[PDB]
Amino acid sequence: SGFRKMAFPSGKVEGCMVQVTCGTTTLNGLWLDDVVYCPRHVICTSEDMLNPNYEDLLIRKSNHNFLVQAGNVQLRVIGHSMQNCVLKLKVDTANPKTPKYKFVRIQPGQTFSVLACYNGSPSGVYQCAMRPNFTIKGSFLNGSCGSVGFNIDYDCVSFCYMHHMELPTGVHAGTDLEGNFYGPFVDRQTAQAAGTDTTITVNVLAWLYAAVINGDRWFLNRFTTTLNDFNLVAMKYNYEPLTQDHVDILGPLSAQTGIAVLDMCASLKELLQNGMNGRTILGSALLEDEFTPFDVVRQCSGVTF
Amino acid sequence: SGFRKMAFPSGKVEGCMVQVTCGTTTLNGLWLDDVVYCPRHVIPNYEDLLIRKSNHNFLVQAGNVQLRVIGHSMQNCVLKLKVDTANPKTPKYKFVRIQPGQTFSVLACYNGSPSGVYQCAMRPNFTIKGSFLNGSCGSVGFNIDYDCVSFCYMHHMELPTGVHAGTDLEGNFYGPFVDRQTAQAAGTDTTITVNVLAWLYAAVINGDRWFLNRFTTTLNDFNLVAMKYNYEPLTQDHVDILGPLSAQTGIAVLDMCASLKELLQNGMNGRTILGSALLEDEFTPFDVVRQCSGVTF
Numbered sequence: 001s002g003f004r005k006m007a008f009p010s011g012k013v014e015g016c017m018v019q020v021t022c023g024t025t026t027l028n029g030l031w032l033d034d035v036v037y038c039p040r041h042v043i044c045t046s047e048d049m050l051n052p053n054y055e056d057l058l059i060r061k062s063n064h065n066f067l068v069q070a071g072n073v074q075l076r077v078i079g080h081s082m083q084n085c086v087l088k089l090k091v092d093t094a095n096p097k098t099p100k101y102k103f104v105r106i107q108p109g110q111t112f113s114v115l116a117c118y119n120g121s122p123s124g125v126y127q128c129a130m131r132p133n134f135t136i137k138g139s140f141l142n143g144s145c146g147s148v149g150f151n152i153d154y155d156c157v158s159f160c161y162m163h164h165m166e167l168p169t170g171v172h173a174g175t176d177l178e179g180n181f182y183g184p185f186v187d188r189q190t191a192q193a194a195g196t197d198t199t200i201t202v203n204v205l206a207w208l209y210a211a212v213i214n215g216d217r218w219f220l221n222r223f224t225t226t227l228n229d230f231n232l233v234a235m236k237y238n239y240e241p242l243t244q245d246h247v248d249i250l251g252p253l254s255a256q257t258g259i260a261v262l263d264m265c266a267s268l269k270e271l272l273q274n275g276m277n278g279r280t281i282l283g284s285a286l287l288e289d290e291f292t293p294f295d296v297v298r299q300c301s302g303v304t305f
Numbered sequence: 306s307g308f309r310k311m312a313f314p315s316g317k318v319e320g321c322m323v324q325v326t327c328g329t330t331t332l333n334g335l336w337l338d339d340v341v342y343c344p345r346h347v348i349p350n351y352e353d354l355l356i357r358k359s360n361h362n363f364l365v366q367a368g369n370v371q372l373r374v375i376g377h378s379m380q381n382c383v384l385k386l387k388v389d390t391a392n393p394k395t396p397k398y399k400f401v402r403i404q405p406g407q408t409f410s411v412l413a414c415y416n417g418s419p420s421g422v423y424q425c426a427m428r429p430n431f432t433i434k435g436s437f438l439n440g441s442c443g444s445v446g447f448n449i450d451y452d453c454v455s456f457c458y459m460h461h462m463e464l465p466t467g468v469h470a471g472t473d474l475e476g477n478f479y480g481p482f483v484d485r486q487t488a489q490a491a492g493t494d495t496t497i498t499v500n501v502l503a504w505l506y507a508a509v510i511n512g513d514r515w516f517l518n519r520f521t522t523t524l525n526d527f528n529l530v531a532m533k534y535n536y537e538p539l540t541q542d543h544v545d546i547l548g549p550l551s552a553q554t555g556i557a558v559l560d561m562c563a564s565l566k567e568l569l570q571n572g573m574n575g576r577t578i579l580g581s582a583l584l585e586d587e588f589t590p591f592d593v594v595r596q597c598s599g600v601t602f
């Protein structure tokens with residue numbers, strides 16, 4: 001019993017965190033085999049950030065301009081290249097602590113763990129979701145750039161995010177490990193703002209199924225809904241449209257609890273209309289959207305209370 | 306910017322998790338140097354049950370390697386299995402006993418394999434609101450101070466309300482519990498007042514000031530009000546501990562108490578604080594300072 005926002009154990013990622021310094025800028029890098037991956041803005045000044053020409057800034061650098069530190073050991077950079085918004089620093093030593101890993105690009109609604117780092121040293125781990133507007137609501141201070149997001153289903157680390165910047169609203173933007181930004185963001189000090197955010201509907205439904213598994217059914221009703229009538233109502237509360245894929249994905253949780261997806265959609269519609277009336281669901285007074293159907297099946301028991 | 310429920314990095318603890326099997330029971334153990342620590346219920350008159358066991362009855366598995374048990378002893382509700390191999394991954398560590406209100410990270414494990422990490426607090430009723438399934442017994446709670454792991458909790462059981470109970474690493478239970486199948490229940494819980502105040506200071510630091518007002522209060526008037534909402538009494542020590550956050554934000558502790566008093570009497574009125582519609586009590590003053598400063602390990 002219980003339902004917590006649970007992160008993956010971070011040990012496999014901790015052994016990959018290094019510090020990268022170029023001139024006055026210091027940030028974090030991910031050391032996998034003989035390559036250190038880091039945000040390309042490590043080559044920038046604060047002035048450069050308005051309209052940086054990364055190709056022009058990079059051609060002026062040599063390998064020995066990049067200082068890489070793994071613990072108390074200085075790594076020697078023997079090559080460098082840029083792939084999209086990430087810099088790949090070839091080093092003389094392969095990381096003996098390199099785990100089994102993949103680089104995966106995720107979709108909005110997907111969750112992952114963030115190992116927040118400063119000066120190549122891990123400070124904390126927390127669970128996050130890629131918002132529908134492609135930002136993340138993280139907890140990051142200056143010096144956190146290069147911190148990574150990941151999942152560890154089985155013993156393989158799937159790296160899905162590298163931190164690049166904080167937007168004016170306090171939310172965060174970054175790239176996959178191939179350097180492609182999530183969303184329409186640029187690694188430039190440009191007037192850019194997160195688009196209007198929405199609630200991840202499939203995740204709220206998954207969390208309502210988690211509540212039923214743990215023994216709570218106060219929020220259910222005798223009604224059902226068509227998928228179209230549910231979406232017409234959901235859009236009015238800034239909820240993401242629910243697709244047939246989302247309905248298919250919720251199939252296993254529907255079969256375990258005995259509550260059809262469209263019947264759980266009817267309960268959500270009523271919760272949006274009435275609120276909670278002094279009650280909570282899994283210790284929360286708001287509808288939680290940062291647990292996916294996969295996270296619920298992973299954390300919850302296979303036997304409904 | 307941002308404020309999340311953050312756990313310590315778990316790597317130093319992951320390298321200590323092992324699987325312990327005795328008969329039909331399988332649970333987790335903590336391997337430090339040449340000793341594996343686990344709940345004694347893996348084997349009730351525990352001394353009588355233990356005398357009938359030999360070293361070879363305890364099967365200990367670290368990853369894909371079988372460790373050989375060469376001795377065993379009981380300390381309170383914890384079994385200490387002496388093994389033939391010292392853990393080469395043993396970190397710098399201490400065994401510490403925490404107080405209610407203090408927080409810690411839990412590395413939840415099944416079959417000696419870590420599955421997740423989450424942050425939680427020792428409730429004033431000595432239970433923890435964890436997330437554990439069958440097979441999680443022996444999972445540990447800890448804090449990291451510089452490079453030293455301070456082990457503070459070992460999981461033993463789930464109570465009927467779904468909350469959890471366990472011991473320190475010396476085998477002493479947190480709370481009036483016993484390690485047997487009998488009628489036991491968590492007492493009525495209260496809210497950790499000093500932690501709610503710390504979280505209100507975290508909200509101010511993150512730019513949320515709607516709850517701030519011109520009023521102040523006395524410690525006595527605040528405590529009279531707090532007792533009526535099932536909040537723990539606020540002591541002069543709690544006021545002293547909140548000193549740094551008070552100086553940083555410019556809001557006196559009894560000034561923040563007047564805001565909390567108004568939040569208890571009026572509610573949030575459709576508003577949230579740090580993305581929450583409830584008053585959060587699982588961040589200590591030190592957790593707030595640490596997350597709003599970037600301390601590393």
Ligand SMILES: COC1(CS(=O)(=O)N2Cc3ccc(Cl)cc3[C@H](C(=O)Nc3cncc4ccccc34)C2)CC1
Pocket residue numbers: 041049140141142143144145164165166167168172186187188189306
């Ligand atoms: C909205 O302005 C802020 C960021 S900044 O200092 O202006 N900054 C400009 C900028 C622009 C583009 C890119 Cl790719 C990186 C950056 C940098 C940046 O985003 N750094 C930070 C990342 N993650 C959390 C940070 C919390 C605080 C400070 C800085 C952080 C540096 C919050 C102050």
Ligand SMILES: COC1(CS(=O)(=O)N2Cc3ccc(Cl)cc3[C@H](C(=O)Nc3cncc4ccccc34)C2)CC1
Pocket residue numbers: 001346437438439440441442461462463464465469483484485486487
């Ligand atoms: C009231 O909870 C139940 C627990 S039990 O299976 O009866 N149980 C009896 C018992 C007695 C003493 C001691 Cl020290 C440990 C235990 C065990 C226990 O507590 N295990 C569990 C711990 N943490 C989460 C668990 C979630 C599910 C199951 C079991 C868990 C085994 C479901 C009925």
Ligand SMILES: [Cl-]
Pocket residue numbers: 105106107110
């Ligand atoms: Cl995805």
